[PDB]
Structures are given as C-alpha cells and as structure tokens.
Design a protein around this ligand. Structure first.
Ligand SMILES: N=C(N)c1ccc([C@H](N)P(=O)(O)O)cc1
Ligand SMILES: [Mg+2]
Ligand SMILES: [Mg+2]
Ligand SMILES: [Zn+2]
Length: 889
C-alpha cells in the first residue's frame, strides 16, 4: 500500500480541459465512452501519462483517434493505465476510451451502481476512476458534457450536472439525454442518476438578484409522499445562507435525490445532491422524530457545500477539513437557528465529547489535517468533520458575528473559483482579527496548531478571591498528552467564553468576555468583583477541550440551577455525575477485586437530587434540557476517564446511581410523564406535512426518557402506561413502547405488533431493527439470530446491516460479555461485509475503537478478533489498513 504524504503535493504535468461522456446503460452492463481534451502543463517533464482507473474492462483506448496497442504503447493493471511517454503528444490532444462496468453487481456503492431500481453514481473521493479513466484528484478541473442513454421504461428520468440540452429517442425502446455543464469542476462532483423517479418541486426566488431557482426532490414512486419536509428544509437552507452569509444559489435548478443503498448520509455533486433515503425521507406516520432534525441537517449540509466545497475547491484531500469542518460549522449554525432549542448545540457537544474524544485518545488519533493517508475512504472521520467544525466555530467565537462574517466574505470573495488550503482560511480570519483588534501586528499564526496538532487539550482552573480588594483571579493551565504524532505538544490558542455568577441572586457580574489563553498558563484578574463569584466556564463549549472546572458540587449545583448558559448548566450536571461515577466505580471495583462479603457505596448527593427535582418541576424550564439532566453521561464519554475499564463494573455503577435517583424521584417522573402527554402527543398538525415543532418533539423525548427510567425501575403498574403508549400514532412513542417493554413479559407481543406497523416502509423497518437491536434483553443473542433469519437475511443494504448490529454494540453488559461472543459476532459481520462493501465493514469496526481502554481480559478478547480479521486472506485494503492502525501494528 502506497502512503500519500501531505508534504509531497505537486501539480499534475497534464491538463484535462474537457470531458465528453456517453454512458450507455444496458441490463447486463454499462458501456462508458469518454473523450478527454487534454494538454501538457507547465509542470510536465516528459513523464508517462498515468490515469486512474479501477475495475474497468477496456474495449479500446486511443490518442487523437488512433487506437493504442496494449503491451507496446500502454499497460493496465486494473488500477493505473500507463501510456508510455513516447506515445503521448506534446501539445493539445484528445484521449478517448471505451470501457465496460457493471453497476448491477457493484455492491461497494462507490462509482456507478444500482440501488434497487435506480442507477446512481458516488464519486467522492476516488469513485470517478471506477467509472472511466481520469487523473482522479480534486485539483484537475474540467468542463463536462454528459450523455446518458437507457431503457425508457426502466429509466424514464435521467439526470446529471448542468443544463439538460437534448433528449432523444433511441431504437429498441431506449432514450437519451445530454447535459452540459460549462463551469469547471473536479471529477468528484460529477454525478448521474437514472431511474423511475417521482418528484415534488417548488420555485425559489433569490433575495438579491431575484433569480428563479427550480427545486426538485426525487424518490422512487412508493415513497414520494415523504419528500415534503426535505423540500421545506432546502428552502430554509437557501434563506439561511442568504440571511447569515449573503450568499445566493448560482444555478437555475437544484435536484435532491433519495436512494435506498448509500454508504453515508449524502453527497454534494453540483446541482445534483444524492442522499441516503434515511436522510431525505420522512412522514409523521412512518418516521421517528429524529428523522426531522436529521433531514434538516443533511439537506442544509449538502446545500452549504455549494460554496464551501463546490465554488471554493480543495487543492488536495489533506485539506478535507477545510470543506467538511467548515460546512459542518455552517450546518450547525443553521440547525441551531432553525430549531431554536438549546439541545441542538448540546447534542453536537455530546457527540464530540463521546465519539470524537474517544477517537482522539485512540491509536487512530490524527489532527484535523493529517500528514499522510493510505486509504481516502477512511479519512472521513469525526475528527476531520466534528473537531474541524469546532475549530471553524472557534473563529466565530474569537471574532464575533460582524468580524467573523467579514472574514468569511474575505475568504469567499478571494478564493471563489480557485482551490484553497487551510492557511488561506486562516489568513482570511486573521485579516478580520487585525480589523477587530485594530492593529496589524496581531496575527493568528499560533491558531494553525489546531490544524496540525492531534489529541484533546486539557484545560484546568484554580481561583482566588480577595474580599477586601474585590479582586477575583482565574488561573488557567492547558496540557495536551503527547501521542504518536507529536512527542512535544505546543500550547494552543484557546478562547474561553466566561461569565461570573453571583451565588446570592444568580446574576451576571461581568459583561460577555472571552479569555484568549495563548500560553501554557495564564492568570486572568478581574477588579470590582463585589462578592466571590461562581465562574461559568467555556460557555457554549467554546473550545474542543477536556474541562477541569475544579468546582465543588455545591458550586456546580448553583450553576445548574442559576447560570444563563445551557452548556455550562449541562456540563456542571455532567461533572457532578462523573465525580459520582468514578467514586462508585472504584468502590465496586475494590469489592470485586478483594472478593468482599460486604462493603459500602457512597450515595448520590442529596442536594444534587433536589436540584434535579427543582428543574423538572419548573413549568418554564425546557423539556429537552430536562431530558439531558436525568440521563447519565454516555458510556463512551465515561471511558475517557477510567483506565482498564471493566464494563461490568461500569454497568453496576450506572445501575446504582440510576436507582439512587429513581428511589427519590420516580413519583416526580411519573407525574410529569402524565402531565406532558397532552402537549407532547398533540395531533393538531399530524396531517400537516410541513409543520415541524422541535419543542414538541423535545417533550416526546422527555416523556420517552422518563418512561424508560420508570420501566427499568419496575414502577408500580407502569406496564399499563407502556401498553397505552404502544397505541400512539407517533413512531417515536410506539417504538419506545417496544424497548421499554423489554423488562416485561409483554415484550414479544409488542415486538410483533410493532414489526407489523413497520414492515411495509423500508425506513421504518430499519428503525424497528435498531429498536430491537438496542432492546435491553437477556435473550438479546437469540433475538439477533431471529432478526438475521427472519428480516435481515442476505441484505447488502448498509442501512439494514448497520440497523441490526450497531445499536446492539452499545449494550454495555451484553455486547461486552466476558466470553467474547459479542466481539466474535461483530467480527464475523465485519468480515462478511468486507467481501462486498469495505467502507461499511470499516464502519462496523467502531466498537473496537476503544479496545485498548478496557480491562485486560476484554483488551485481549477484542485484539484476538481484530487479529483474526487481519488474517483473512481476502481482506480489503481498506479494512486491513484500518485494523493495522487500530491495533498498533
Ligand atoms: N467517501 C465517502 N463515503 C463520502 C464522503 C463525503 C461525502 C460528502 N463530502 P458529505 O460531507 O456527506 O457532504 C460523500 C461521500
Ligand atoms: Mg436576595
Ligand atoms: Mg430493501
Ligand atoms: Zn460534507
């Protein structure tokens, strides 16, 4: 396997100016004819002309309409086509080829492939070379002219980029359409779609130039009534980009297309965005609530790429975070603004601190701009995306909205229509930073360490208050643990949004303030502080760091009750829970280790319990927020703080803490579950396809969270509530009725009822699978085997595979069974999957990312499975490289 290093970037010694494609789709094969109008660049040195091309069957290749001779004038090895330089022209020339590919049997879902009865392409990052020969890298910009032909009755709708310029009948019941797209683009943005597609459409008129834009959303006929919310989300996305950024869509049409088989959420391809059906389609009847926010965020994300990926391009794939982390940042601003709920930002933080922190302390840790890769298919990571988004969001925290907007415009204005690197972004923010600080000595040079340095910084605090002097000091330290990528870690530029809360009346004591920590430590002093404050630190989660607030639980309770910032309130709660978790974990571990016949557990802080009750009972507090405070921190967040974590001891710790709080609050939880029903389950708008109320869905999350707490606690007669819940029209409710019924004899009756409600909608059935897979069942292994035999079977749909096995891997007691049978089961599924879809096989490795953080027995069991997979003679390059890096080989 070749290793690509970021420092080795050099421009191609060739130019491709024009691509002209003819893609002829037949039932047993697709013939692709391509003519590339090419040139020799100023960088050329008489080298062999080398095209990427993977899995292609050559019929013929030519230069200048002269057929080339295999062996004598070219070699092809199923990966690279080499045309020896003696046969390569020295001025403008045409390369042409005709190859055969087979989308029908393309189950890896990259290149051209068939999803149910739709043919669709997926080119990012290196799929275009699976379609035809090309210099398949994002700095090769070309014009595209694409003709598609196919059976008219099977494929009446043909789409590609640009303007449809011609449509034409072909003998034998076939038809064609030609699409010309004059603006330059990289090949990873080419797309083609052919299918019996149905649609909804609307016209959008842009804010400034008043241009009409036609919006089409497409799916197979069965699901066309689930397209309306996506169309609404698209309108919202366009308006947001206009409103916040002043940016208007440049083209006359935008197509969104849903397909059933897709490796990730969706893909921006210029004017032709293609989506996993689960991130485009929803209805109130056939979708769980989470689908609504998911579609808004993925539609927004792909729309925002139209500037941040599509009009300002990436020079090379090492700059991926510049398009992805910037677009996730824009997508997160948009969602926060559309949902208007504080839980939107909290949910982003929750994801970073569980999944991305776990990645950044694992053997796979990498900075958001890595120095090397082997597999581009494994470069699309929570680090590159979600820590990149926090890095891009820190610019806004530092600058504020006016100067951030100014600097963003500087970047867009200067790099619209060219490639770019992370430095150019940083330069643009710096110009805004000089303008903010009003001095041109000021720079963001140190900021660049956020791109290059791996690992999560740790930020810790000590405090001093002089009551006579009215003088308050915050002493701050930062530390990043050395790792494989830097032995010596340098201090980062860390912005710390802070408030000072008067603990007597709950009031802010200072104006908005963001501390700029730029050294390994600093002391920030504040005068005229009338009383000793409680500090509100990292408001909004203002940098991607481990926060060690060193506050007492009494101070944390005060913040939870009285602070103005949702994140700090939640983080204070989280810190109270972590202190409690680590204490009980250690008490349980000592008892197991010492084989104690009796021992004590530290109970949960009574005043913390009272503060939770105070918040739950407050009719003006937010239901979404309330759902966060009654939930312990995620298991993958906890693991960052325990060595050799024993998953059974953690499971007993959680069980103790939940029962401690439940023994005090379950009557409160019951009462709320009942009083919330009317508003949470309100049907007034159930038949209004465009009316989406995030606050109401947050009430359902709270009722469903409370119902789960009550069911695990076998609260008196709660089964009555569970059965009544099963009859709700909302799938979030009736699927919750399935999971919480696990603790009763009614489980299999609800399994059957809900299966019947789910089985005739492809996506709802996948949600039902997830609900079953995650059910807290002692017979969970037998239940998986029933799903395999009765529902999943031989499906190669990644949504089905992931739905059956991923939720199960979060089952702390059972997935981590000490026999290793859970690790064995997932490894078998990875290996089976890897035979046809290496990308999804790698995704299914996720449970193994924390292998080296568990107790020594479980480290050994997981390592044994990883080593078994690595020994498979037929292992993909993708899977092999991932498992080699994960196991530190
Ligand atoms: N290699 C892939 N699986 C892949 C990676 C990224 C993308 C898109 N960039 P996205 O960030 O959904 O917009 C689409 C597909
Ligand atoms: Mg008072
Ligand atoms: Mg299917
Ligand atoms: Zn993206």
């Amino acid at each position: 396997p070749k290793i690509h290093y970021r420092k080795d970037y050099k421009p191609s010694g060739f130019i491709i100016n024009q691509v002209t494609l003819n893609i002829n789709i037949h039932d047993q094969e697709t013939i692709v004819r391509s003519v590339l109008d090419m040139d020799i660049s100023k960088h050329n040195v008489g080298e062999d002309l080398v095209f990427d091309g993977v899995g292609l069957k050559i019929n013929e290749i030519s230069i200048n309409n002269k057929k080339l001779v295999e062996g004598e004038e070219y070699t092809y090895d199923n990966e690279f086509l080499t045309i020896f330089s003696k046969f390569v022209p020295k001025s403008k020339f045409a390369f042409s080829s005709e190859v055969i590919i087979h989308p029908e049997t393309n189950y890896a879902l990259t290149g051209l492939y068939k999803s149910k009865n739709i043919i669709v392409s997926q080119c990012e990052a290196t799929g275009f070379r699976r379609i035809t020969f090309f210099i398949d890298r994002p700095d090769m910009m070309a014009k595209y002219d694409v003709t598609v032909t196919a059976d008219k009755e099977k494929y009446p709708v043909l789409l590609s980029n640009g303007d449809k310029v011609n449509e034409f009948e072909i003998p034998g019941g076939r038809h064609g359409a030609r699409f010309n797209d004059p603006p330059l683009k990289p090949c990873y943005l080419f797309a083609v779609v052919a299918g019996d597609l149905k649609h909804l459409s609307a016209t959008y008129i842009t804010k400034y130039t008043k241009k009409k834009v036609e919006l089409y959303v497409f799916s197979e006929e069965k699901y066309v009534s689930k397209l309306q919310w996506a169309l609404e989300c698209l309108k919202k996305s366009m308006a947001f980009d206009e409103d916040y950024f002043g940016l208007e869509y440049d083209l006359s049409r935008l197509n969104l297309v849903a397909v059933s088989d897709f490796n990730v959420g969706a893909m921006e391809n210029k004017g032709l965005n293609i989506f996993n059906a689960n991130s485009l389609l929803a209805s109130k009847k056939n979708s769980i609530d989470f689908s609504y926010a998911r579609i808004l965020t993925v539609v927004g994300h792909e729309y925002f790429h139209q500037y941040t990926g599509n009009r300002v391009t990436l020079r090379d794939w090492f700059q991926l975070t510049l398009k992805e982390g910037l677009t996730v940042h824009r997508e997160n601003l948009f969602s926060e603004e559309m949902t208007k709920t504080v839980t939107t930002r909290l949910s982003h933080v929750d994801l970073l601190r569980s999944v991305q922190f776990l990645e950044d302390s694992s053997p796979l840790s990498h900075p958001i701009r890595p120095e090397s890769y082997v597999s581009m298919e494994n470069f699309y990571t929570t680090t590159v995306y979600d820590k990149g988004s926090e890095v891009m969001r820190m610019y806004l925290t530092i600058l504020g909205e006016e100067y951030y907007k100014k600097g963003f415009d500087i970047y867009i204005k200067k790099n619209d229509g060219n490639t770019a690197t992370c430095e150019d972004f940083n330069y643009a923010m710096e110009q805004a930073y000089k303008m903010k600080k009003a001095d041109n000595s000021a720079n963001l040079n140190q900021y660049l360490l956020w791109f290059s340095q791996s690992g999560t910084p740790h930020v810790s605090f000590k405090y001093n208050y002089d009551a006579e002097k009215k003088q308050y000091s915050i002493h701050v330290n930062q530390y990043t643990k050395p790792d494989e990528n830097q032995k010596e870690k340098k201090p980062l530029f860390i912005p710390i949004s802070v408030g000072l809360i008067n603990p007597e009346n709950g009031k802010e004591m200072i104006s908005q303030t963001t501390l700029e920590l730029t050294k390994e430590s600093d002391t920030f002093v504040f005068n005229n502080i009338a009383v000793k404050p409680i500090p509100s630190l990292f408001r909004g989660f203002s940098a991607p760091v481990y926060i060690e607030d060193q506050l007492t639980d009494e101070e944390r309770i005060l913040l939870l009750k009285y602070d103005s910032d949702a994140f700090v309130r939640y983080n204070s709660c989280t810190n109270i829970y972590m202190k409690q978790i680590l204490m009980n974990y250690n008490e349980f571990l000592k008892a197991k280790n010492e084989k104690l016949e009796s021992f004590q557990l530290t109970p949960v802080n009574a005043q913390f319990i009272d503060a939770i009750k105070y918040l739950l009972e407050d009719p003006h507090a937010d239901a979404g927020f309330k759902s966060y405070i009654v939930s312990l921190p995620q298991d993958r967040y906890i693991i960052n703080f325990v060595s050799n974590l024993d998953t059974d001891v953690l499971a007993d710790t959680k069980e103790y803490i939940y029962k401690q709080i439940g023994d005090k609050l379950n009557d409160v939880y019951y009462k709320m579950f009942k009083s919330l029903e009317a508003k949470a389950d309100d049907l007034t708008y159930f038949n209004d396809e465009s009316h989406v109320d995030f606050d109401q869905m947050n009430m359902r999350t709270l009722r469903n969270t409370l119902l789960s707490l009550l069911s695990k606690a076998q609260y008196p007669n709660i089964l009555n509530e569970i059965i009544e819940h099963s009859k709700s029209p909302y799938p979030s409710n009736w699927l919750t009725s399935l999971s919480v019924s696990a603790y009763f004899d009614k489980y299999f009756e609800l399994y059957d009822k809900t299966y019947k409600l789910s089985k005739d909608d492809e996506l709802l059935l996948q949600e039902w699978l997830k609900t079953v897979s995650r059910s807290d069942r002692k017979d969970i292994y037998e239940i998986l085997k029933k799903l395999e035999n009765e529902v999943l079977k031989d499906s190669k749909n990644p949504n089905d595979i992931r739905a059956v096995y991923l939720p199960f891997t979060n089952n702390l007691r059972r997935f981590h069974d000490i026999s290793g049978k859970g690790y064995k089961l997932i490894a078998e599924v990875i290996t089976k999957t890897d035979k046809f879809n290496p990308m999804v096989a790698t995704q299914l490795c996720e449970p193994f990312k924390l292998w080296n953080k568990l107790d020594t027995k479980r480290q050994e069991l997981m390592l044994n499975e990883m080593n078994t997979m690595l020994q498979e003679p037929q292992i993909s390059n993708n899977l092999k490289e991932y498992l080699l890096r994960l196991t530190n080989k």
